[PDB]
Write a protein that binds this ligand. Sequence first.
Ligand SMILES: Nc1ccn([C@H]2C[C@H](O)[C@@H](COP(=O)(O)OP(=O)(O)OP(=O)(O)O)O2)c(=O)n1
Ligand SMILES: Nc1ccn([C@H]2C[C@H](O)[C@@H](COP(=O)(O)O)O2)c(=O)n1
Ligand SMILES: [Cl-]
Ligand SMILES: [Cl-]
Ligand SMILES: [Mg+2]
Ligand SMILES: [Mg+2]
Ligand code: NA
Ligand code: NA
Ligand code: NA
Length: 326
Amino acid sequence: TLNGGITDMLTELANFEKNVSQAIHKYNAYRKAASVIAKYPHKIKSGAEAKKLPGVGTKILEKIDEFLATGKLRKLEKIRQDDTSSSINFLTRVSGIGPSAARKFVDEGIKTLEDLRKNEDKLNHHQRIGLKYFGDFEKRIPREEMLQMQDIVLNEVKKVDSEYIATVCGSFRRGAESSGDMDVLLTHPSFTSESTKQPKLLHQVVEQLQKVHFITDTLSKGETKFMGVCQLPSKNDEKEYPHRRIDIRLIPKDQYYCGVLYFTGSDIFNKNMRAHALEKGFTINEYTIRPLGVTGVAGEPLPVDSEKDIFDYIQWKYREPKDRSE
DNA sequence: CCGACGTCGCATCAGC
DNA sequence: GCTGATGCGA
DNA sequence: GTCGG
Ligand SMILES: Nc1ccn([C@H]2C[C@H](O)[C@@H](COP(=O)(O)OP(=O)(O)OP(=O)(O)O)O2)c(=O)n1
Ligand SMILES: Nc1ccn([C@H]2C[C@H](O)[C@@H](COP(=O)(O)O)O2)c(=O)n1
Ligand SMILES: [Cl-]
Ligand SMILES: [Cl-]
Ligand SMILES: [Mg+2]
Ligand SMILES: [Mg+2]
Ligand code: NA
Ligand code: NA
Ligand code: NA
C-alpha cells in the first residue's frame, strides 16, 4: 500500500496505547489517523501534507516527518525494548486477555506462551480457548474458505427452521479477499422488537452447528450473541483446516437494517458514522436510529426501510459495503 | 482552552 | 440472588 | 491524540 510504513507505525502506537497505557481514546485516535491515511490516494511526502487529513494532528505529523526522514520512530524503538511493554503486548494477543489481565499476569510472572501453557488453571474459560487456538486465530481466512463456511451455516440454519435468515457480514460482506473471522447476523420472525414468541432461537442454531461438528468451542453465549470457534471439515488424508473464530448475532427481525449496518462495519467506519450522527443530532446503534432533543436524551426510533435510509437521516451519501473498509 | 470521543452483549466481581 | 461496575469483546 | 465550540 502507498503509505504502509506510516500506517503500520500508527497502528503499533495505537496498540501500545490500548494494551500498555490503557488509554482507549488515544488508541481510537491513532487508528482513526491510520485509517484516513490508508485511504489517501497519494504517497505522503511530509507531515504537513498528512496534517490536512481529519484525525491527523500536530503530534502525528511530527512522527510522520521523523518516520519519513529515518525510516523509524525512536518512540517505538524504545517501546520495543521495554520488557514490560513487550510482555503485555504479547499476552493481549490471546483472546480473552485484555490490558488489565495482561499486566496482572506479568505481575505474577506469567509472561510467555510457555508460562501460559504451564498455568492453564489461572485462565478463565475464554482465555483458555484463546490459548488453545493461539496460532490458528492469527491466521486469516481466504474468501474461498469463507464461501465454504457460508454454505454450511446457511444450510444448517435452514435445517433447523426455514424461517431463519442468516447473513454473513463483517469483512466478508464488504467483499474482502480474506477475513479475520466469520460474522453471522441471524433473524427469525418469532423475534422482533415487539416480542419474543419463541425461546432458544440462538441456542437451537448453535446446537445444530455443534452437532454437525462445525462449531467446536464456545467463548461466550447469551440470548442474542454467540462468540466461539468453528472449523471446516477436511477430506480423507487432508491436513485439517485451522480453527476459526465465529460470531453470531441474533437481531430483531424488524431491525435488520440497523443490525446489518452495524455488523458490516468496519469498526472504524461505525465509529466515524455514529460520531457524524451525533453531530447531526442522532444516535445510531445496532437496533435503531433515534433523534436527540435539546435534552441530549434519545427520542423515539425513526422509520428505517433500508440501509440507505440511515445514511439519509445523517445527510451522508450512501456507501456500499465494499466502500466501508475503514 | 477543554469536554467529548460509538454503542452495546456476555463474563466476572463486589457489595448488599 | 440482584444490581452496578469493570473487563473484553463485537 | 484530535477535534470543535
Ligand atoms: N469495536 C468494534 C468491533 C466490531 N464492530 C463491528 C463492525 C464489524 O465489521 C463487525 C465484526 O467485527 P470483526 O472484528 O470481525 O471485524 P471485521 O469482520 O470487519 O474484520 P475482520 O476481517 O478482522 O473479521 O462488528 C464494531 O462495531 N465495533
Ligand atoms: N438475515 C436477514 C437478511 C435479510 N432479511 C430481510 C430484510 C429485507 O426485508 C429483505 C431483503 O434482503 P436483502 O437485503 O438480502 O436484499 O430480507 C432479514 O429479515 N434477515
Ligand atoms: Cl432497522
Ligand atoms: Cl434502541
Ligand atoms: Mg470479522
Ligand atoms: Mg467531537
Ligand atoms: Na488534520
Ligand atoms: Na486479547
Ligand atoms: Na468477528
